[PDB]
Amino acid sequence: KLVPLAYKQFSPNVPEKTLGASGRYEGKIARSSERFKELTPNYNPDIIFKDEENTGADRLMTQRCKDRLNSLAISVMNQWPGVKLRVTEGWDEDGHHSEESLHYEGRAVDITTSDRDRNKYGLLARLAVEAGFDWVYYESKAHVHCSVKSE
């Protein structure tokens, strides 16, 4: 039933920031922006946040992103007992991506399984699609990129 995504594959099969997918970039959200109130914390106890920058900024995302992320968290545990959803990257303030990255406004996450078993990433990407993320992309061997439309 669930066919894993192939490496470098994305779904839907169109560029990310286009209509049928995640839609267009709506501008960066810096801490000091009024847009900041669009972000909302995700405190899901069953999602691992890498939190590499130590700020917990990884947890701040749109309500839409949060909701897709949470459901994925539940199907991940369903697909593999012992394994959870993991986020390596979410809201980015340091421009570590392209121009107009959805990461810049809390509409994108980079995910893995909690066990970091790259063997799982293809199937994970698929679950993310099932979870209703609006664009899912097996970006690299080490993580999967998921994004959503704006509200």
**Contacts with Zn ion, residue ranges (CB under 5 A):** 110, 145
Query: In the complex with Zn ion, which residue's Cβ is closer, 68 or 145?
Result: 145
Q: What span, in angstroms and rounded, lies between the C-alpha atoms of 82 and 14?
A: 34
- Which tokens sit at 106? 């809390």
Q: Is 51 annotated as a binding residue?
A: no
Question: Which residues neighbour 62 within 8 Å (Cβ) at sequence distance 6 or greater?
Answer: 38, 39, 40, 105, 106, 107, 148, 150, 151
Query: In the complex with Zn ion, which residue's Cβ is closer, 44 or 88?
Result: 88
- Kindly state the smallest distance separating residue 82's Cβ from Zn ion, in Å: 26
Query: In the complex with Zn ion, which residue's Cβ is closer, 1 or 65?
Result: 65
Q: Is 34 annotated as a binding residue?
A: no
Query: In the complex with Zn ion, which residue's Cβ is closer, 37 or 128?
Result: 128
- Kindly state the smallest distance separating residue 145's Cβ from Zn ion, in Å: 4
Q: Is 26 annotated as a binding residue?
A: no
Q: Is 117 annotated as a binding residue?
A: no
| DSSP conformation letters of 38-70 | G-EE---TTEEE--TTSS-GGGEE-HHHHHHHH
Q: Tell me the C-alpha to C-alpha distance, in Å, between residue 140 and each of 33, 71, 89, 111.
A: 31, 23, 13, 11
- Are 149 and 22 contacting, i.e. CB atoms less than 8 angstroms apart? yes
Q: Is 96 annotated as a binding residue?
A: no
Q: What span, in angstroms and rounded, lies between the C-alpha atoms of 96 and 81?
A: 33
- Kindly state the smallest distance separating residue 81's Cβ from Zn ion, in Å: 27
Residues annotated as binding site for Zn(2+)?
A: 103, 110, 145
Residues annotated as binding site?
A: 52-53, 58, 88-89, 92, 94, 103, 110, 145
Residues annotated as binding site for Ca(2+)?
A: 52-53, 58, 88-89, 92, 94
